[PDB]
Each structure stands twice: as C-alpha cells, then as structure tokens.
Amino acid sequence: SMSYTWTGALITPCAAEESKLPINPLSNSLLRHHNMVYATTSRSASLRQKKVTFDRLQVLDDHYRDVLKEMKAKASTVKAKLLSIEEACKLTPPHSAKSKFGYGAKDVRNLSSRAVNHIRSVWEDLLEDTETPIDTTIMAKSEVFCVQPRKPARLIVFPDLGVRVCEKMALYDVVSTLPQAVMGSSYGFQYSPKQRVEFLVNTWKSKKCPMGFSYDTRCFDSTVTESDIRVEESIYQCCDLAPEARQAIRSLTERLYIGGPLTNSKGQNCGYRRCRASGVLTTSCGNTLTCYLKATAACRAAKLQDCTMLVNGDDLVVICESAGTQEDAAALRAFTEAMTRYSAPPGDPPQPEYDLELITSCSSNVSVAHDASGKRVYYLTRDPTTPLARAAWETARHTPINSWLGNIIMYAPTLWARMILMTHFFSILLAQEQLEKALDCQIYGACYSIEPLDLPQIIERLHGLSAFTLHSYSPGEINRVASCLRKLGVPPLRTWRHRARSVRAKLLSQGGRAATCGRYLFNWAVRTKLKLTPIPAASQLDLSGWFVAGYSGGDIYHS
C-alpha cells in the first residue's frame, strides 16, 4: 500500500520558523561562515513528502519466518510490568507538546486533576475501542545542518499528550527490556560510546579476516509496512502482560502504530499514514527489531558467513567473515536484494570495508589516539560539521535541548569536542556566570538534566581518564577535522589553545568543581601538565539508566 496519501492541505508551522543563523557576537567567534548554517522549515515539506510517499513492495520468505520465530522465542522469556499513571506522568518532559484537551506537560508532571482524569479516559477508551484510528499531528521538523557541495525537513507524526502518557503506561517497560532480551549484544542502545567501540573492536578482532559494512535504508520509517508493525506486536505479545496492557498494546497497534489520519497545525486533514510514525513510543524499539529481523534474515539469504549485527533503530552495521574480495561484493549485493524484497531498499548503495575506521554507523566511526603513557586507545568520533553548526545555532538562540552538551558527553575523547566545544561553551558560561545552572540534553533520545560542572566526573566514568590526555590522533581523523574547520570558518588550533589556557586559568582561580573542570578538561592546552588522578565523585555515579534503550521520538524524560 501507499506509505502516505495526501488531501492537498499543506503541512503548516505552528509559529514563525527561523532558517538562518543570526549574526551573533558569540557565535561568530566559533564559526565565521554563518551563511552556511541553516535550519529546516515547513517550506521544504513538499520536497520531503514526495520522497517518503510511495507504494511498498514486500515478499517474505522462510529465512524471514525462521528468524521471526527465533526472536519470538527469546521474547517469550520477558515479563513487562505496566506503569501507573504517576510513573508514566513522571516520564514526560517539561517541554512536551501540550494536550488539545486543556492541559500541558507541567500539569501532567504535577498530576493535576484535569490531566490525570483525561489520561484515565484515554486509557479506558483504549481498552474499549479496538478500531478507531487515533488522530496524529504532522509537522515539519526544525533541524540544523551545514550546506553541502540543502536537506528538506523531516516529517514528525505524533499523537496527543494524553495518548503519549498511555503509551508509556502500556509499553515503557516493554520497549526498555525486550530489545535486549531479543537481540542481545546486537542491541546497540545498551552501550555507552566506549562500550560501543569495545563491541565493534572485539567483534572485528574475532574474525579470521574481517569485512564489514553499514547499510543505509532509504527513508526507513516509510518502508515499514502494516505487516511489519503487526509482526512487531506479535513479538511484544509474547511477553507476560497484564490484561489491560495486552489490550492497550492490541488497540494501540491497530489505532495508532499501523497508521492513521494526519492533521496539520491548523487542524486540517492532511492525509493518511500507513507506515511508521516517528513520534510514538515504539518507534525506536520497533525500528530496531524490524531492521534486525530483516537484516539477520537477509544475511542468511545472501550466504554471508559469521554475521554480527549492531542495530540502533534504523541504523545498521554488519561485521562478518570475509570470503574474498569478489565474493564479498557479490554476497553484499545479494544481501541488498534480500533486504529490498523485505521492503528495506537501500539509499546509499552499501560497500564492503576492510578497515574498521572507515565504517560509519550512527553517523560515527571508531578511531585511534594515544594516552600519556603512549598506549593506543580506541574511541568513538564522527565528522564534526553538524555538531559544530548546531553548536553555533545553540549559541545564537535559546533551545530546549543543548546538542552541544550531549556532543561533549558522548564525544569527550575527540579532538574537536575538547579543543572547540569545551573551550567555547565553558568560556561563555564563565562570562555569563552560569556554570552552576543545569541544562537539558538528549542521550539516545531520552532527555536529561545535566550540570556542566559535573562533566569531569561524567567523562571519567564513561570514557576513562585517558579522555583527558589523548594525543596523536590518526592522520585520517586529523584531516577530517582540519578540512571541516576550513569549510565552516572555524578558528585554527592556535586560537583555541589560547582561549583554552585563558578559560583554564579563570576556572582554576574559582576552586571547587570549576577548578576540577579546569584541571581535567583543559590539560591538553598547557605544556606543564598536572597529575590527573581519579575524581572521587566519579566512582559515585549512577550512569546506568543512561544506556539501556533508545527513545528518539518517544517523548521520554529521565529525572
């Protein structure tokens, strides 16, 4: 069937939309070519619609069915708990889109009488009505990028706040435990960046002669069929569930997940969806399961040997045993055809790789540097272009989420995050006297509130002390950063070192946590290094909930 149908009504913005980076005194010291930075708007919605709208082709076979049964068997061991309205409410972000029924996030989080009562009515309605397609709102997403040698906005589809809290009640525990019980070490969201690298390296070393590749599905959400979503529910149904949760899941599947009506910001009927909605609780879990299912089966059809998958939603990387150059290239092409038949056609044609550092997955790749002792150390990095453009934008405007803080946390060991992000943002926080202020950021889609002054601890626990002493990065990494700085108009190393040494001094003089930030975060800037010993607060961190599952589009907040 058609992934989408359109009435003709436009996808409209609910307020004015900014497209250009404002000429700001502070963002200009980070990035000069401000005209290269842009944010998508609804004005490009039509271009996106045309790309995601098409009829799907799907042919299932024995390999698919065999893998599905293997996955259901493992799912059979799980027992999902069912959240109370109180717990579900507490999982709602403060800035979550308000309900059209007289209440918003604040009320939801505060358990206000009107919020709670309506949520109860929406839940009871899910137990009673098993058919009526639930209404969803479709919007053009606003994201920042750097012009390339422009991307049309993505389309987000999400139900009302009331429905979202109900999704949590019935499926939060399921989407938080089942992916792991089903896919095991292959479920990528259970890993911290350091652990992801460890998994990729150990998997790479376990092969006699390794071969790996990333597989890019052309617009994955629209390739997801009604059949895929029902198969996905069949997996959830293997869980031991409370009757109400079992019915809720059944109803949510038929009324929301498999598709439904689309309404724009103006309240106009835009069309109908028969594919994956990006803004519902099961999107991350659902896509991971579906991508893994189709991929594991594709590998068997393609005769690839010793396949090890690493899946994060629609993002896939496969590492297997090489059977020779010619054969690998043929088996890969066979894989792509199997995937195409399963309704997961490629966007960028896949290419076999024999060098781990050259494999990009989750927009990232493994690279090597060295610690003070001189020992090689692997870490996760990525092209800094987007992180920097976004860091520029978040510097000129106020944003609910601070991607820069998230990029610092996940990419602490990288040369670009240390030299540029840390220096730029710490110097700004000092000048404004806001180092104490906690800011929000996302990790695997979940929203978190983090105190800048705790970064040293966080970084030590997640990456180890080596993150503060790495040097001698690979020629490959060095070149990518260099050319990026030239393109975006970012000041050279020498300038950042000067700013860094200045920020460092002002931080040390303050003592306390600030001095710790100065000692660890900026040890790369001074010649007279300081002894970097284990930070006390580091060994007392509860960073477990940080890497359990994916929640992008899930409207999830962890307090």
User: Is 29 or 58 the residue whose CB approaches ligand 1O3 more closely?
Assistant: 29
CB of 83 within 8 A of CB of 242?
Answer: no
Render the burial of 477-512: b for 16+ CB within 10 Å, e for the rest: beebbeebbebbebbeeeebbebbeebbeebbeeee
For ligand 1O3 (CB under 6 A), the number of binding residues is 12
Touching Mg ion, residues 176-235 (CB under 5 A): 216-217
**Separation of alpha carbons 451 and 435, rounded Å:** 8
Q: How far is the CB of 472 from ligand 1O3 (least distance, A)?
A: 5
- Decide which of Mg ion, ligand 1O3, none touches 126; Cβ closer than 5 to 8 Å per partner kind: none
Q: How far is the CB of 522 from ligand 1O3 (least distance, A)?
A: 9
- Decide which of ligand 1O3, Mg ion, none touches 217; Cβ closer than 5 to 8 Å per partner kind: Mg ion
Among 76, 132, 472, 483, binds ligand 1O3 (CB under 6 A): 472
Cα 272 vs. chain centroid, distance in angstroms? 26
Residue nearest ligand 1O3 (C-beta atom): 471
Place of tokens 């040097």: 471
User: Is 157 or 421 the residue whose CB approaches ligand 1O3 more closely?
Assistant: 421
- Which tokens is 122 given? 């929406």
**Separation of alpha carbons 188 and 490, rounded Å:** 33
Stretch that binds ligand 1O3, among 65-73, 99-107, 314-322, 411-419 (CB under 6 A): 411-419
- Decide which of ligand 1O3, Mg ion, none touches 482; Cβ closer than 5 to 8 Å per partner kind: ligand 1O3
CB of 218 within 8 A of CB of 350?
Answer: no
**Separation of alpha carbons 120 and 115, rounded Å:** 9
**Separation of alpha carbons 155 and 164, rounded Å:** 18
Among 473, 522, 547, 557, binds ligand 1O3 (CB under 6 A): 473
Stretch that binds ligand 1O3, among 117-125, 185-193, 267-275, 478-486 (CB under 6 A): 478-486
Beta bridge partners, 321, equal 210, 305
- Which tokens is 166 given? 């109900």
- Which tokens is 101 given? 């029924």
- Which tokens is 186 given? 């292959």
Q: How far is the CB of 314 from Mg ion (least distance, A)?
A: 5
Q: How far is the CB of 521 from ligand 1O3 (least distance, A)?
A: 10
Residue 228 annotated in ligand binding: no
User: Is 4 or 468 the residue whose CB approaches Mg ion more closely?
Assistant: 4
The dihedral through the CA atoms of 247, 90, 401, 362 has a sign that is: negative
Interaction between residue 471 and ligand 1O3 (CB under 6 A): yes
CB of 267 within 8 A of CB of 160?
Answer: no
Interaction between residue 530 and ligand 1O3 (CB under 6 A): no
Q: How far is the CB of 439 from ligand 1O3 (least distance, A)?
A: 23
User: Is 323 or 526 the residue whose CB approaches ligand 1O3 more closely?
Assistant: 526
User: Is 217 or 469 the residue whose CB approaches ligand 1O3 more closely?
Assistant: 469
Q: How far is the CB of 451 from ligand 1O3 (least distance, A)?
A: 23
Interaction between residue 482 and ligand 1O3 (CB under 6 A): yes
User: Is 301 or 485 the residue whose CB approaches ligand 1O3 more closely?
Assistant: 485
Q: Which helix (H) or strand (E) holds 302?
A: none
Nearest CA among 496, 504, 465, 501 for reference residue 371: 465
- Decide which of Mg ion, ligand 1O3, none touches 444; Cβ closer than 5 to 8 Å per partner kind: none
Among 481, 514, 517, 538, binds ligand 1O3 (CB under 6 A): 481
Stretch that binds ligand 1O3, among 301-309, 397-405, 465-473, 505-513 (CB under 6 A): 465-473
**Separation of alpha carbons 81 and 555, rounded Å:** 19
Number of other residues whose CB lies within 10 A of the CB of residue 186: 21
Residue 107 annotated in ligand binding: no
Q: How far is the CB of 481 from ligand 1O3 (least distance, A)?
A: 5
Among 209, 478, 505, 530, binds ligand 1O3 (CB under 6 A): 478
Interaction between residue 493 and ligand 1O3 (CB under 6 A): yes
Among 34, 109, 168, 418, binds ligand 1O3 (CB under 6 A): 418
Q: How far is the CB of 21 from ligand 1O3 (least distance, A)?
A: 22
Residue 315 annotated in ligand binding: yes
- Decide which of ligand 1O3, Mg ion, none touches 123; Cβ closer than 5 to 8 Å per partner kind: none
CB of 531 within 8 A of CB of 523?
Answer: no
Among 257, 411, 522, 524, binds ligand 1O3 (CB under 6 A): 524
Beta bridge partners, 103, equal 99
Nearest CA among 58, 282, 62 for reference residue 170: 282
User: Is 50 or 471 the residue whose CB approaches ligand 1O3 more closely?
Assistant: 471
Secondary structure (3-state) at 157:
strand
- Decide which of ligand 1O3, Mg ion, none touches 438; Cβ closer than 5 to 8 Å per partner kind: none
Nearest CA among 133, 139, 119 for reference residue 49: 139
> C-alpha distances in angstroms, 291 versus 79, 196, 252, 287, 443?
23, 18, 21, 6, 21
**Separation of alpha carbons 239 and 451, rounded Å:** 38
Secondary structure (3-state) at 146:
strand
Residues 419-438: x where in contact with ligand 1O3 by CB under 6 A, - otherwise, as a string: x-------------------
CA atoms within 13 A of residue 318's CA, in its CB half-sphere: 28
Question: Environment class of residue 149 by beta-carbon count within 10 Å: exposed (0-12), middle (13-18) or buried (19+)?
Answer: exposed
User: Is 126 or 467 the residue whose CB approaches ligand 1O3 more closely?
Assistant: 467
User: Is 255 or 418 the residue whose CB approaches ligand 1O3 more closely?
Assistant: 418
Nearest CA among 523, 525, 516 for reference residue 498: 525
- Which tokens is 293 given? 């299912």
Binding residue ranges = 216, 314-315
Binding residue ranges for Mg(2+) = 216, 314-315
Q: Where do contacts with ligand 1O3 occur on this chain (CB under 6 A)?
A: 415, 418-419, 471-473, 478, 481-482, 485, 493, 524
Q: Where do contacts with Mg ion occur on this chain (CB under 5 A)?
A: 216-217
